[PDB]
Amino acid sequence: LTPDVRNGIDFKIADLSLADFGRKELRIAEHEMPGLMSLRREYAEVQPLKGARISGSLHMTVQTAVLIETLTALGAEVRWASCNIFSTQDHAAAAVVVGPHGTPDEPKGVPVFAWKGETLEEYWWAAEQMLTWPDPDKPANMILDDGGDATMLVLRGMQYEKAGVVPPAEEDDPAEWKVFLNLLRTRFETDKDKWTKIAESVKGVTEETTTGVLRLYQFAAAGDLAFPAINVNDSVTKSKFDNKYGTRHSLIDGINRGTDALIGGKKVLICGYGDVGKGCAEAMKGQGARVSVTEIDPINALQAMMEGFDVVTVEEAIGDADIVVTATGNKDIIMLEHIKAMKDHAILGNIGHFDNEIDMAGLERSGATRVNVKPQVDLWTFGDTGRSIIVLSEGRLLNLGNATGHPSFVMSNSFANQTIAQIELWTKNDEYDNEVYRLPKHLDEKVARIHVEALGGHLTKLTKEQAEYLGVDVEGPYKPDHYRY
Amino acid sequence: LTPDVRNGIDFKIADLSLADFGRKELRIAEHEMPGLMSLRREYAEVQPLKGARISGSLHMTVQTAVLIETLTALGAEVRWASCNIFSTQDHAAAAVVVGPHGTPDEPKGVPVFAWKGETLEEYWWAAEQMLTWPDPDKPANMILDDGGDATMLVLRGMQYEKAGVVPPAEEDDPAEWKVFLNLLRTRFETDKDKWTKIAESVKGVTEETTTGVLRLYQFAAAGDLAFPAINVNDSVTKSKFDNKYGTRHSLIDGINRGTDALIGGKKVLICGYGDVGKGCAEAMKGQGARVSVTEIDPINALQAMMEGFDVVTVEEAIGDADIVVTATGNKDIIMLEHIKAMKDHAILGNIGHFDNEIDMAGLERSGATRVNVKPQVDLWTFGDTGRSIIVLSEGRLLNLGNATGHPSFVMSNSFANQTIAQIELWTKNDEYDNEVYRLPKHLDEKVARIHVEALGGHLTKLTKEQAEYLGVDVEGPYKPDHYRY
Amino acid sequence: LTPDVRNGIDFKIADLSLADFGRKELRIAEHEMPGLMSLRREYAEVQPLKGARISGSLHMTVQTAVLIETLTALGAEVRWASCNIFSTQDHAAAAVVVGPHGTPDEPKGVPVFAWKGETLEEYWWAAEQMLTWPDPDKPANMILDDGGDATMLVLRGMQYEKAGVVPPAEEDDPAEWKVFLNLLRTRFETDKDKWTKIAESVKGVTEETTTGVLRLYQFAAAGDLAFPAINVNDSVTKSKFDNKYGTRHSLIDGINRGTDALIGGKKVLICGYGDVGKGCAEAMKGQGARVSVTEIDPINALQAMMEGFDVVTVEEAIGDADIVVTATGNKDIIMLEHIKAMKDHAILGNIGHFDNEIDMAGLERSGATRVNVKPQVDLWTFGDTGRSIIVLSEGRLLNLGNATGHPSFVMSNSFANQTIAQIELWTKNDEYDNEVYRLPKHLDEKVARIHVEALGGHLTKLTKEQAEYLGVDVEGPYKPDHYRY
Amino acid sequence: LTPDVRNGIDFKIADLSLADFGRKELRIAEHEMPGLMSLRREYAEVQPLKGARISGSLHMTVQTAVLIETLTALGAEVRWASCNIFSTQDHAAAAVVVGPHGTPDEPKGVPVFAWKGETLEEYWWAAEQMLTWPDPDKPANMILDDGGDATMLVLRGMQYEKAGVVPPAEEDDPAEWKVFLNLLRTRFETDKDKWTKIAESVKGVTEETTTGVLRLYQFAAAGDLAFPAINVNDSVTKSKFDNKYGTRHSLIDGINRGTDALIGGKKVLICGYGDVGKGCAEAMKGQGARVSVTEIDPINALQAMMEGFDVVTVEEAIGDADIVVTATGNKDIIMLEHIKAMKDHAILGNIGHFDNEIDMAGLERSGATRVNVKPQVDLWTFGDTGRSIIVLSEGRLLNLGNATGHPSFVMSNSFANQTIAQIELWTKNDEYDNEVYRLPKHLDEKVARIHVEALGGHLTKLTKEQAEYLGVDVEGPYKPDHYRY
């Protein structure tokens, strides 16, 4: 595995000749991303990210391409990889390397190391490529992360360097961990302070998703967070719109392309009822499914029941479920005994960040036989019961695996928030300690306002007396800090 | 007006002979309020509220009666009044005075000053009764408030005593403000220190609703909050359940009893899309309404659009609305000009805490003529256009004015939070400063767990491995502090 | 029991002084009933109902009152009674007897024999009063019927007159059949051809509901239909709108006023998924209920599954239902064995035409004890289990018994169909045989058009080319005769 | 163009090597089509279609593949073509040619003339191939039709042979009409009575869709219906399930794959509110869209209003619509003038049987310019306004053109009906005249029962007393002939 180089740009992608297709969809997406397009306009003169060297680890989609090109319009240099082995849209990756005025023979874009259907070894090689800038005097100085893999590589890397050794993996370790440690160990043989130096160069990280935010909280509580982080997941305009309405769009899209199964009339088990599980349940309910929900949290469980759903355990419900979706951000939700309990020709997938919600290692070592139907759709048969289960995307987040993830208008919210966070952390870096921050409410309301306007909504303007009555400025922010929407 | 006294209990209510009917509905309600019944059992031996003398200002309904009888079961003495002129359920008021083992001839319950259809003057006389305990050496030492009227009475009262004069009112003050000052001004002529003594005796206030919580944040900003306060509105199990799913139930109930108007096929305008407006929109949508929404907050506005509703102004939409509902907690939403814009036989109501959302003073002074249809339903005719508007509850919150407010199972959440807050504030008073607090998450989780259990929900339990992965205890709390559900 | 007579009108109602309150709601209802009002204008000069002496058996509500004064506006003379012992709105009965221009002292309306809370004896008495015109040479010449009770009295009465004997009642016959036969037997002692002469005078019947229609098909198949009948239920604008959307409104209204039980979060069982069951399920779903459905018809069952509802038997679901509603038009749906299986404080009600959907007779003889809570709400308790059930309206149709039935706007559809059917049979009587007929499609479209317009719907007009391509006239009808909508 | 031949099969498909993939999807579909599988078993020994030579014109999808191998399993020979240029799934075509036991090199399936993306020339050539059986001598004896193109070819073809002349194309009128006449006139040169003889030979036709049924009523009314026809569309289990629920599934799938446009928050315009329009509205609403509906029929319009949708004309709503879908079965819905009024990047599509709902010919002549994005997705730009429109599938039914059409479980209803009608007409042919017939109710109930059971629905069985009460047999049918569900 060696990078391709064309016109001084290193990259590794499926097919550069897809760029023309990619560029057409990027141009359509620009129309549906008023959040990103409005920031390009506002900040074009300013060039706020001049001097930034952004290493981004985030699903390489059409929507992420509009994000990358917003960061470049604003002055940044970037290097990119996908944060999932199946989530890259190859036409979009091609268009990013080529750029808006380039061609396949004369590319003018940025380094991308991403393609749909990477191996675990390829996935971590690409991550390192993305994190490794060409000039050893000029390493990465910002991270843009989705799920924390980039942050993990730099932070665990420095840890092993400081300790003089990369540990062995245990044989019972998850495959991906073994792959990951192998990369660190191999690099340690030839370069002894790689990750330490990169960690000292990173000015901040912006983290897009619930799972990665959890991991940041875990680093920070260990005293191991080496630079400022902005939790972009928990922008109101992100968590409450992307995780919820995005999923409401793209869950059924993933299931449609993977299976073409009728959803109406089917028993559907959704595991977890946070923002993700809420959109799942709503999408399924809208299509005529009979939905039940699982939960550990009594508050989220009570919401599920008030929304018309039984709240049940996997053990009691799994045998009746026509479709099973894991939405928890936890591990060990659907174990091999659960999968063996499923009815014949039931569908199983995961829409949480990591594949470990489903016991895929157990199913693979089970003695069940695998028949591939098409990309990211496998029929698994158990010889002892004779029952076959359809598994989507090998357990990896199925909306991006089997379809195209959330729609542009939704990602416009999430990516306007990331762009704002990148701009804040870069230009105002000396206002942040080595802690996890969220964006102020006035910026979340700014992102909302752009999208209401684009949809044709008419906001009401408070009169002077009304603002005084509420104790707010006419221009916001409108809600107290703990307000939950 | 003078109180009635029977068997040493002072009260003022419509009809003590309604006690038998009241008791029946209280007993039914006990079955639908596991949150309150669970607290009675748990704290029965402890008697945590022994010594408390709670002045309660809160809609005197069946649900409130079960709350009162929880506080007395747990050791408190109470005196009660309603926080709205139209919200009392007379049978429930009678049952509280009589108590579970009393009769109308031998009552064994608590002082209540409340009936449906109070005048403004009577409303404020009753609050004064409720706040004035019989032994001058043993004044109120706890307030339980809904909308802040009791708290306002004590704090403005003490303010004017400290100043040595009660302000005169301006001719352009609302009627209710004039009434309120008249009360304080009258009492100050014969008792110069009444409210100061009460204010010093009060060890804390618990506050049930958004409007009241705002007024608390406004007092604490002014240097003027004399005792700790718990913000019960913003327990997750209150705001996200009472304000939303409560209103989903009781908005259409109030409209039904008042008008029997078909909702399917009608255009409905909901002003505000916070928790209350969300419930409103959801109920109306479920009945086949064509719902549009008004908002000042682009985040809430963007949620409304994502839920299938146009976001519009009162100015553009008012002429087309079959039904108009204010849900803002703000004032001056529907002014005289808007009411005159409304189509013939359109319906107008408020479900926010105070009647000032609608310009009732302007309508009553306008020269429109009023025909009363039935209690809390009035038909107003404008002579110049010839159009008639149906107004519900004279602008007072219509769910409680035209119907019975939220159902028992919902109030059980709110009132379990209220009871917990009373217990915490009473038994641990020294741990609190003169600030607004919210309950810790683990107590909101406790409340939710009781109700999930009661409905037949089955919670999943985290393994030690899962809990470690998530950074949580197996027993909660399960979410970070800023989690919005 | 003896009729009152006042100013030349015989009647028996609760209270004439309710006339003013009734008249206000009648005038409000007129605005919500453009189907009826349009007909009054269209047929004002024509007087198509001159000569007609109409005996109506139909729930004496505000809506029926506007139907009555439409019939009189078009020339008819009427006599009225209700078709249910709990469905009369006493204020509407008073306004009908009084008239738009009468007073309680000098009434100028029509004979009404109806009040809320009739006994079975009083009910059948009133139905005889309604079918018995004062001049014996001018008997009833038309029937307007709901449930088929008036038609049954006339046709059975004649049958027993011809047989020379009214047969004794069987011991295990329902209480009401015993009362119905008493009425006939007692009248037959003194008047040997009363019902023959009325049945010979009746030119036609119009039947407004599914149950009455079934009985008309039954009479006609025995060769006992003495006059032509119009099936008004099966007009598209009746069945698809009244039975379905009317019920979506009034089912939850009845349950609210009777119990104030939270619907969200609760398990609800609907028996039957015809138009009524469909309306029930949708209402319940819209409020956050977890709905299951029972059915004998696999077509209606498949629809319910496609609509997100488990299809289940009474036996499997009864134990866990919080609310149970029967909507089948059939008998013996919830038997005593089921009621004994129900959970503590579960709610039981019927919304089909007759109370025999529920085994009330079994419950009354079971040894369960009854506590009345308020009118049409009874708590029944089994000492053996200690569990209690709330029964609504003694198993009588709960929407009209616990609330006000369907809203004016919906009833406007049904009652325009009935007015048109009355006109058609009266004026074109010799065009009909003694069979059951449905109105022609263009008259259904006519009724629909009126209400689309009233709601602000904008119809598109076919071009000449389009209408030719579809094979229809620009003015309709637009659908083939078997079209199901 | 010339058919391929391998191993005694003539065919014309994209690629035989796609058989393996096709066969996997076919085996998955068999599990989702219990209506078809139940019929294979029921009639396996009987072989009811022995002797039938069926010419089927129907979208060549995985579902139709399972119907084809049902017909052959039952003793028929078949020849197949798709009824739309874009709706063929190429891998299903290959699996049908190859058969369940053949190889790409020695196929053991049946003749198929179909690929995704035919020209109008190719479509009509394929239609002729499908209708022309190899033995002179032994021509088609059964037609299975969808849209009525096959029937039109046979019946109009005969009409010109009786006249002795195929008329001139003309300068204008549709481009497709020209192709159709061209094909006929070319054949008339060499074979003077081809179509007369095929028509004489055809015993009956089964017609799958509303549009083709309308065209049958048009032929029959002319007196030109040459053989018996079964109207399959209007089986209750077809129209109320396929047209409504299948569309609810496949409309958003089409739009998703074509555009990935967010549906939530967008204004959507659905033209027509019959079964397809119903399903369209419901899908969009479930995804959070703001839906409006157009109609010519006041009954259907009144339904849409009661379902929460404004009823509007194209002219009033076109300017603000984000997405526009035609679902009428009529022509000239969205004319060029409308397309010019649409907003920038609005999406336009048709889901009715034919493309003429949308003025494609006017668009193509208007001077707007087309950029192809990917197959069945075109961006058209008007240089005068600078605004662009996305058009799906060149205005052909978008669900099959941009995705996969309705799911197998849905198609299992329609295709069980089709198979049954084919058995009825083939085995009981002498009992039918040259008229349009619908299947009896018991057969509809039969189909629904299979799917209810498949989904785990549990029907209740009437007692003998209940069935007596309703006037029905325990085994059904349960409803009167005119019942609308």
Ligand SMILES: NC(=O)c1ccc[n+]([C@@H]2O[C@H](COP(=O)([O-])OP(=O)(O)OC[C@H]3O[C@@H](n4cnc5c(N)ncnc54)[C@H](O)[C@@H]3O)[C@@H](O)[C@H]2O)c1
């Ligand atoms: N009747 C009841 O049973 C009941 C139940 C709960 C709460 N309440 C009361 O309801 C009110 C609202 O409560 P909430 O929890 O929804 O509060 P909230 O703050 O969540 O929602 C109010 C919304 O109104 C909007 N708003 C403010 N001024 C406006 C204006 N001029 N026009 C349009 N929108 C505007 C705000 O942007 C906000 O999102 C408060 O008065 C509260 O005490 C009543």
Ligand SMILES: NC(=O)c1ccc[n+]([C@@H]2O[C@H](COP(=O)([O-])OP(=O)(O)OC[C@H]3O[C@@H](n4cnc5c(N)ncnc54)[C@H](O)[C@@H]3O)[C@@H](O)[C@H]2O)c1
């Ligand atoms: N794409 C698919 O998978 C699919 C499935 C089933 C049916 N169809 C096709 O869809 C079309 C519609 O089918 P249907 O079963 O809903 O028919 P339908 O007759 O039940 O409904 C069509 C509706 O269009 C309305 N309409 C007609 N002309 C109109 C106009 N100018 N403006 C506004 N509204 C108008 C009619 O009043 C009618 O109610 C037919 O072509 C049918 O063959 C397609």
Ligand SMILES: Nc1ncnc2c1ncn2[C@@H]1CC(CO)C(=O)[C@H]1O
């Ligand atoms: N039945 C009911 N009993 C008592 N309180 C009720 C009821 N229904 C709603 N509420 C209150 C009213 C309010 C604003 O004043 C709230 O916040 C609530 O929770």
